[PDB]
């Protein structure tokens, strides 16, 4: 996260770290949506152009974390994966359309002050809150800037960013933008900055409903062209649009 701040303890208790077993390293963010299901970006698990195609046994998820690199004894919980589910129409060939995946855990994770699921939006909450200018919140342990000399945070970072008008999103890039994406970030003339960056993808873009005071995951950190560049925006998977697939997977395999 660029131009964010350190998270408060328990601020994002649905935050999940996708962790490579060997070598031991951060791969991506992710989010807890129930005691057995974790949501992330498909490209965190499958991206053939970079020879990426992880199997369940390659990975762990670490839940309840705050520190990036520390083993947070008595606080974090580390879970093995039972099964990965990638959206069947995830478009890794072109533009990361439908950049969404689910991971079922082998055992349920115990909830605590530090571990708690986020809500997925209903149609109405999505319609009401997915509006240009409305801000959501992005969290992760990714890099602090696009370019750095070996740069990376001690603890989970947080940044609040406004949703951007679709024509502005489209006009910022040569990539084909679909209805399964939205973009967020400040415009060059807006005086504030911030973005996701490398290592944040797969993590959540959340909004706090003013109707019921619950946090909803509206987006998944999907892609950007650099980090925090003027005139560029981060792109997020539109969770509500893909929710029928989420429900189908959980209903069938849950």
């Amino acid at each position: 996260i660029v131009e964010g701040s350190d998270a408060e303890i328990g601020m994002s208790p649905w935050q999940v770290m996708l962790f490579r077993k060997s070598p031991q390293e951060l791969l991506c963010g992710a989010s807890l949506i129930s005691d057995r299901w974790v949501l992330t970006a498909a490209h965190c698990l499958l991206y053939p152009p970079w020879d990426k195609n992880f199997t369940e046994n390659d990975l762990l998820v670490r839940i309840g974390k705050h520190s990036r690199t520390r083993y947070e004894r008595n606080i974090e919980k580390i879970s093995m994966l039972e099964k990965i589910y990638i959206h069947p129409r995830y478009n890794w060939r072109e533009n990361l359309d439908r950049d969404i995946a689910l991971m079922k855990l082998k055992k349920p994770v115990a909830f605590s002050d530090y571990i708690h699921p986020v809500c997925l939006p209903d149609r109405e909450t999505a319609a009401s809150l997915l509006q240009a200018g409305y801000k959501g919140r992005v969290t992760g342990w990714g890099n602090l800037k696009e370019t750095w000399t070996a740069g990376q945070p001690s603890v989970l970072q947080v940044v609040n960013l406004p949703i951007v008008e679709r024509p502005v999103c489209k006009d910022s890039t040569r990539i084909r933008i679909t209805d399964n994406m939205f973009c967020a970030g400040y415009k060059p003339d807006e005086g504030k900055r911030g973005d996701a960056c490398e290592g944040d993808s797969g993590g959540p873009f959340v909004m706090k409903s003013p109707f019921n005071n619950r946090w909803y995951q509206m987006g998944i950190v999907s892609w950007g062209e650099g980090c925090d560049r003027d005139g560029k925006y981060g792109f997020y998977t539109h969770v509500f649009r893909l929710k029928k697939w989420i429900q189908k997977v959980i209903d069938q395999f849950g």
Partner: peptide, 28 residues
Amino acid sequence: EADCGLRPLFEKKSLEDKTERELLESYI
């Protein structure tokens, strides 16, 4: 879940985090 999106250290205690108000103020 029925209890989704309510944080033990924040909403469950009626404590606000340091920047959630920025989000609320944008929901115009």
